[PDB]
Design a protein around this ligand. Sequence first.
Ligand code: NAG
Ligand code: NAG
Ligand code: NAG
Ligand code: NAG
Ligand code: NAG
Ligand code: NAG
Ligand code: NAG
Ligand code: NAG
Ligand code: NAG
Length: 1151
Amino acid sequence: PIRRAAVKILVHSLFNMLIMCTILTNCVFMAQHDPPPWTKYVEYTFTAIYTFESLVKILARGFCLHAFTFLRDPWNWLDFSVIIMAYTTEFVDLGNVSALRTFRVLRALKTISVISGLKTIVGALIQSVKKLADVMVLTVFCLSVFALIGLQLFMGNLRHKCVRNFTALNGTNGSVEADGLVWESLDLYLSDPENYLLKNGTSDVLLCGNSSDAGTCPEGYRCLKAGENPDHGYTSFDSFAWAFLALFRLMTQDCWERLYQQTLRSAGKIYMIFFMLVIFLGSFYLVNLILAVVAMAYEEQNQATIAETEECCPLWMSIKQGVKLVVMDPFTDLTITMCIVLNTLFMALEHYNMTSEFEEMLQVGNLVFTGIFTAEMTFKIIALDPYYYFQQGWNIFDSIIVILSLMELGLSRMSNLSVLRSFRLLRVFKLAKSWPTLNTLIKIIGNSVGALGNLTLVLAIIVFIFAVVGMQLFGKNYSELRDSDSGLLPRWHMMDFFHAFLIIFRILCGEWIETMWDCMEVSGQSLCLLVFLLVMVIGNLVVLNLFLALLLSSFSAGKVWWRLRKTCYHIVEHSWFETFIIFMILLSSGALAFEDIYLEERKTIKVLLEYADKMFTYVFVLEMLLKWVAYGFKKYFTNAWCWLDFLIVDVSLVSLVANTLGFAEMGPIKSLRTLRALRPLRALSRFEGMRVVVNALVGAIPSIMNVLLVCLIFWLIFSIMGVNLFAGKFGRCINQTEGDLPLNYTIVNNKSQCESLNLTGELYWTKVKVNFDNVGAGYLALLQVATFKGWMDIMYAAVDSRGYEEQPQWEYNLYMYIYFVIFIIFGSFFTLNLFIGVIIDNFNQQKKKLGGQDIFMTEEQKKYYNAMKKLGSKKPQKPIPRPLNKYQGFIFDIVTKQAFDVTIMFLICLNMVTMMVETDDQSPEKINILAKINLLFVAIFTGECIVKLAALRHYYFTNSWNIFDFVVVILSIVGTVLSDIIQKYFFSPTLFRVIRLARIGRILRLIRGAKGIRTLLFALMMSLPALFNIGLLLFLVMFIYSIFGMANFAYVKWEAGIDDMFNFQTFANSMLCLFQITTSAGWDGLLSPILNTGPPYCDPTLPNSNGSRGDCGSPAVGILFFTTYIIISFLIVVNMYIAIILENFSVATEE
Ligand SMILES: *[C@@H]1O[C@H](CO)[C@@H](O)[C@H](O)[C@H]1NC(C)=O
Ligand SMILES: *[C@@H]1O[C@H](CO)[C@@H](O)[C@H](O)[C@H]1NC(C)=O
Ligand SMILES: *[C@@H]1O[C@H](CO)[C@@H](O)[C@H](O)[C@H]1NC(C)=O
Ligand SMILES: *[C@@H]1O[C@H](CO)[C@@H](O)[C@H](O)[C@H]1NC(C)=O
Ligand SMILES: *[C@@H]1O[C@H](CO)[C@@H](O)[C@H](O)[C@H]1NC(C)=O
Ligand SMILES: *[C@@H]1O[C@H](CO)[C@@H](O)[C@H](O)[C@H]1NC(C)=O
Ligand SMILES: *[C@@H]1O[C@H](CO)[C@@H](O)[C@H](O)[C@H]1NC(C)=O
Ligand SMILES: *[C@@H]1O[C@H](CO)[C@@H](O)[C@H](O)[C@H]1NC(C)=O
Ligand SMILES: *[C@@H]1O[C@H](CO)[C@@H](O)[C@H](O)[C@H]1NC(C)=O
């Protein structure tokens, strides 16, 4: 029949064009929170077109029995469901919930089939996800184990609050309280939130945990355990569910410093061992294992697809010749490059408040630059005909630049400042021609948009789908439940699809938990948890896959003198001398830890440390002179290690040469004893682990320098744009009575008003600490944004910026968010892609150039590693033990069977489940049942253990896992015995809990049988030595930076990041903050109090003891400290990633 015409229309291209344009118009119509009534037209035309599509598709391969025809492709089910639902909801509404139209978002997924590239992109995505099977089960296993640990240790330790004092008052039958007023029913006093302490500055409730070191409930306040919870209730370790959630937050490192400062403040400073165990083993190892497995699967499928694809004339011509001769002179190219560079450095010289005529000089300079560029344009277009002069793909770009600049300058008599400059800004891209690194960067961007422009489109589709799902679900909830009595909505809601898109973007960045709480408290926990976990998982997976894709794609494509010399070298030969020196260096480094603010008042160890300093300098200068006398000058001064030692000895000498000789003690002389923090640097040349690691690091300096240059110029473009936009728009007013926020611009908008109403000393026009006012500060804001630490304030200050030097408005520039979206997606993401790519390339070719391949490992560690790799052999021989005599034969008849082990492995999972059921203040009746079932479990375990023992007499001690079972049985028996025996000792939440924790050995007894997890744990057992050397170096860096902070950053004003328990006032308080900052967490809050200066925000001339006239550090050294620490920590964790990936590839591919 006419089926021929239907199948003819099916294979058309106009068909796909119609499908695409209609789907896109729909997606434009689905993203509306409130569509006007005239959609019957719209939605009816849409459902008609979709039914027409499906009709054409079924008239081609149907009429009956469609099993080997249409409906055999799974993407047909989607269209079938869409056309079902589109007609379903037009006659029946019994299920009136209005949450069925949010199934319309499934037809926006049909785009993925009518493009033919996204289909195979998603095929690859699913093929990769199919490989994460083992990683997810290992992740949940370790997360649950650590969650049980945190459950035991911090059960109820998150509820402590500094409550007021009270007296029973003995005036009522029930417990009543007297506190100035009268309460009743003690729980009613405690649950009242008026008997709490708001933490300084913030609006939390001060936690205080009764212990020796953690927290300090103040004078008129008892530190008891009573209250709901912090963060509206979603934080405690009380139940296992909340514990699992908090430890997942820890694993994704999402706002984990807050959990850190809330747990250590109430449980114990010594508990940061738990946090440094989780941040290392869970977070940093599991994230890198995910990266490594996804990269391995991607590269494997890429290898597979590559393997498969394997199979008027006189003067005109005279001037033309002269010009073509002169213009192509490479010296003219050099001077044009210098002109471009000078122009970019001229645009940088713009800042917040330029003096008069400085802007005029800048305009004149850029006009001169325009003249130079148009002269080049004409004197090069004189060369040849546009037949060839308009080719090579570079001249067209230059011509577009010149015409844009010419047009924008001709448009001078108009209003344009923001994008006017951007028409001049893109000249920077010119110098990408003769640069072997900007070529690579633009090769990456082009591969992103041109070749691998399908996976980014998949990402955009997914972001749109999730944003509109979130809108449809959670739109109206925010509206009346959130805004204010004043009526202003939160900063992150889902009532626009722009804020919904922003929230999905922020979840992609990693900050998914604050919005999750804001949403859970209005729209129920179930849906709000499912959505925000699906977005997190899927979006981060696809982002990671895009990262690896682009990375790999752009990557793989008299005569007694000579006796005395040897005599004084004979002692340097003796190892005892070097051991003595190592010990003296350890002492001289440790002696720095005691330089804290309690040293002036100790008054006894002070002079001991003075004399120890003198003796250290003496024994070091003597040792250097002896190295000279025994090494001449050539070998010494060419070693480049003892050059560092000589450098240190220089300042150690100058120290005592200045003080006791010249009595100076003034100016930059004390700045030399703040530089003795470098004494631990002598440890680098002696501990072979750190020597090897620093060799590997300094090896990859050049490539790092080139990429630093290119990223610096790219961030320079972004920072000049930021200065053009935001220079002078961050200045807010603050009424200092109760003020950290603007003053409702309708009252005080301009700075003229802000300084024309100072009848009281209250109005302070205080700019944001980090802002865009010159290219110097722009780089700091760019670091904070691209690191996702402190960017909320930068955004909230730019988005609100309604003009130059005037008070902000709540959302007057709502769309300025798009600048930060563009920055985060280009600068941060692509910069980091290029960065990790060049680093892995350098490390890989450095290892390949060597012999013994692996780096970060000393020869002793290499031998230990070559011995360890033989433990997990391909096949350990079968024991097949002697069966037994009569008695033990009848015994072992049953135990050696292959179902007994599975039975035990399920009983032990039942034991895990009965461990999960714990809860704070569970029940007196229930603790009994739980202890009884626990002793029942240990009884069964002892029974199976003794049966297995009676099975084999000597052949029991060979499995190396059976021994582990026996050990856990013994420790469990001892724990059950000691359970109640104590009855006579001191407070034992620090003893009974740690004798109770030993029962998690049974939980760890699971992995005997899960090969997909035995291998993934061998991948860390076999990799521990390199992690250890890297950890030594990291601890050395922590030590040096903590001493620098203790010298400089003590006596700072206590505010946002620096409280009375995390500050640079002693060695422990400083090592805690530096461990927190190592993961780049909350360093924006640590740096904020340091950038203070004279009043307000501080007050100089304070009488603090050692360094007087303080109360607020200086920005210049603080920014340097924190930025260089961030870079160094980043490099070292990159090294960790490389080690993990290398070892995973060495263990997995070997089998
Ligand atoms: C009971 O109340 C009386 C009031 O006269 C008071 O003196 C006494 O200390 C109270 N005792 C207790 C145990 O509260
Ligand atoms: C407890 O309540 C009863 C009931 O009114 C009251 O008579 C009694 O006085 C109360 N107890 C005390 C100690 O006042
Ligand atoms: C409040 O009670 C605590 C409990 O030890 C005590 O240390 C503190 O001195 C009391 N405060 C006042 C003002 O009495
Ligand atoms: C704090 O310690 C005191 C003394 O042992 C005790 O009375 C109080 O209940 C404790 N509070 C908490 C929350 O541990
Ligand atoms: C500042 O705030 C205080 C109290 O909040 C108020 O009394 C005072 O008038 C305010 N002054 C200015 C200049 O905002
Ligand atoms: C500032 O005050 C005006 C009243 O004149 C009010 O309409 C506005 O909402 C206030 N600003 C904010 C941010 O609420
Ligand atoms: C600032 O705005 C106020 C009114 O909002 C106006 O009177 C004043 O002239 C403005 N000053 C400047 C410098 O813009
Ligand atoms: C406002 O006036 C007071 C009174 O002298 C002054 O201390 C304060 O610095 C002024 N604030 C600004 C931003 O000028
Ligand atoms: C909180 O601020 C008050 C202000 O008087 C101060 O006395 C106290 O020491 C501060 N405590 C902390 C922990 O910052």
